[PDB]
Design a binder for this molecule. Structure first.
Ligand SMILES: [Mg+2]
Ligand SMILES: [Zn+2]
Length: 417
C-alpha cells in the first residue's frame, strides 16, 4: 500500500532538524518495511509565525500501516530531542488517494494561521493515523507537507555532516561555491551573493546541515555537488520544494483587509516619500484599495535600499512582502508607472550656462556676468535615475519562499550579479 508520511517540529536549536530526521526515517523504512517512492518533499509554511519554517513528507509502499507508524515512532523517540521545550514532533500517515483532500489545509498552513484543533479535527474526520509525542503543533506541518499541491516547485540538494562534527565550525572552500555558481547558474540559484561576498547555501547554525543547494534539475544539483569542496558529506538528499515560488503571497484582489502574519502582492502609489531611520532602515507609504500602507526596506537588504530611496510621490508601484507590525517587509518590488514631474524654473544662461537670477517682480531674468536676458521660466520634465521594472533584495537576504527575478518570465528585471 502506497502511504504518504508527514513530519514536522523536530528542530532543536542544537543538533537535529526536520529534514535530517526524515532521512533517517526514510532509511529505516527502506530497510524494514518497503521502498520510498520518488523524492521526499520539503514544504515551507507561513514564514511569519514566531527562521526556517519547514515540514517534510515522503511516499512509501508497505504491507501494513501500523508497522510504518511504529517504525517512524521509534525513529522519533531515538533521534528527536524531546526534552527541548520547542520540539513537538508530529507525524501522519495518509493513503495516496486521501492526500488530495488536504490541499486546502496545506494552502492555509502556507498562507495563513492554523490552530491545532483544526489539525486534530481533520485527523479525527479521516481516521488518519498519527503520532504526537508531546504537543501536536507538529501535526499542522505534517498534514501540510502531505496536502501541499506544487504547481511550481524547485529542488534542493541537502548535504548533512557526520554526527562527530555537529556543533563545530564547518570546513569548505569558498571559491568552490562561487566557481560552481558561475558554471551552473541559473540551474542552481541563490547559493551565493556576488555583491556581498557571502555563501548563502551554508548555514550559520549548530544543525546537521553542511549545505543546501537550490536548483532546477537533478542533473545540475549533482553537478553542483561534485564541484564543491567541503568537509566530508555523510547523508545527502534531494527534496522537491516550494522554495522560490511566492506560494505564500496573497494578492490584493483576494482580500478585504490586510492582516499581520500574512504576506501580500499589492499595488499602490507613493504617498509618504522614503525616509531612513534609527537602524539603517528606509520607510515609505503608498495609497491602496485598503487605504494607507507602510512599506519597509530594512538594513539587511543592503543595496536594495538604494533603489527604494529614490522613488517619489505618486509613483505607481507593486509591492511584495510580509506584514509584521502593520508594515510590509519588502522582498521584491515593481516600478510600474513612473510619476511625471513638471517643474517651472529659471532660465539657464546661453553663454556661461549658469542659472539666470531674477531681475525684479515683472522684470524677467538676467545674467549680469554675461550681458544676457530672458523673459520666461524654463520648463522641464524632471528626469529621474530610477528605471521602471522589477527589483529584488540580494540573495544573502532572499527569504525561502521568495520567487527570485531570475525565475520569472517578465520584462524589465533588474538583477545585480
Ligand atoms: Mg518546522
Ligand atoms: Zn552667463
Amino acid at each position: 500500500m502506497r502511504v504518504w508520511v508527514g513530519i514536522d517540529d523536530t528542530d532543536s536549536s542544537r543538533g537535529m532538524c526536520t529534514t535530517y530526521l526524515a532521512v533517517l526515517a526514510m532509511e529505516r523504512v527502506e530497510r524494514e518495511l518497503g521502498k520510498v517512492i520518488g523524492f521526499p518533499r520539503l514544504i515551507r509554511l507561513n514564514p511569519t509565525i514566531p527562521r526556517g519554517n519547514g515540514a517534510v513528507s515522503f511516499l512509501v509502499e508497505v504491507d501494513d500501516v501500523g508497522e510504518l507508524v511504529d517504525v517512524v515512532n521509534e525513529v522519533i523517540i531515538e533521534h528527536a530531542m524531546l526534552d527541548d521545550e520547542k520540539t513537538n514532533p508530529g507525524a501522519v500517515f495518509v493513503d495516496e488517494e486521501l492526500a488530495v483532500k488536504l490541499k486546502p489545509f496545506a494552502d492555509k498552513a502556507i498562507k495563513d494561521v492554523l490552530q491545532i484543533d483544526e489539525a486534530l479535527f481533520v485527523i479525527g474526520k479521516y481516521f488518519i493515523p498519527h503520532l504526537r509525542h508531546k504537543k501536536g503543533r507538529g501535526l499542522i506541518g505534517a498534514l501540510a507537507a502531505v496536502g501541499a499541491e506544487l504547481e511550481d516547485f524547485t529542488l534542493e540538494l541537502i548535504a548533512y555532516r557526520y554526527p562527530e562534527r555537529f556543533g563545530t565550525e564547518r570546513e569548505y572552500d569558498e571559491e568552490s561555491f562561487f566557481d560552481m555558481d558561475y558554471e551552473l547558474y541559473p540551474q542552481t540559484f541563490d547559493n551565493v551573493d556576488w555583491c556581498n561576498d557571502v555563501v548563502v547555501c551554508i548555514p550559520n547554525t549548530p544543525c546537521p546541515v553542511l549545505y543546501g543547494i537550490r536548483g532546477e534539475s537533478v542533473e545540475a544539483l549533482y553537478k553542483a555537488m561534485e564541484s564543491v569542496k567541503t568537509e566530508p558529506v555523510d547523508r545527502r538528499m534531494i527534496f522537491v520544494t516550494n522554495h522560490a515560488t511566492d506560494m505564500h503571497l496573497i494578492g490584493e484582489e483576494e482580500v478585504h483587509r490586510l492582516e499581520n502574519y500574512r504576506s501580500y502582492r499589492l499595488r499602490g502609489r507613493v504617498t509618504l516619500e522614503p525616509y531612513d531611520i534609527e537602524g539603517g532602515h528606509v520607510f515609505f507609504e503608498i495609497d491602496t484599495k485598503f487605504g494607507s500602507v507602510k512599506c519597509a526596506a530594512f538594513e539587511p537588504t543592503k543595496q536594495f535600499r538604494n533603489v527604494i530611496r529614490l522613488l517619489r510621490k505618486g509613483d505607481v508601484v507593486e509591492v511584495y512582502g510580509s506584514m509584521k507590525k502593520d508594515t510590509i517587509n519588502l522582498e521584491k518590488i515593481q516600478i510600474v508607472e513612473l510619476a511625471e514631474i513638471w517643474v517651472e524654473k529659471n532660465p539657464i544662461c546661453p553663454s556661461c550656462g549658469r542659472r539666470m537670477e531674477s531681475a525684479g517682480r515683472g522684470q524677467g531674468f538676467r545674467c549680469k556676468k554675461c550681458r544676457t536676458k530672458a523673459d520666461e521660466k524654463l520648463r522641464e520634465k524632471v528626469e529621474r535615475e530610477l528605471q521602471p521594472g522589477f527589483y529584488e533584495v540580494p540573495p544573502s537576504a532572499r527569504r525561502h519562499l521568495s520567487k527570485p527575478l531570475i525565475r520569472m518570465n517578465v520584462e524589465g528585471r533588474h538583477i545585480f550579479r
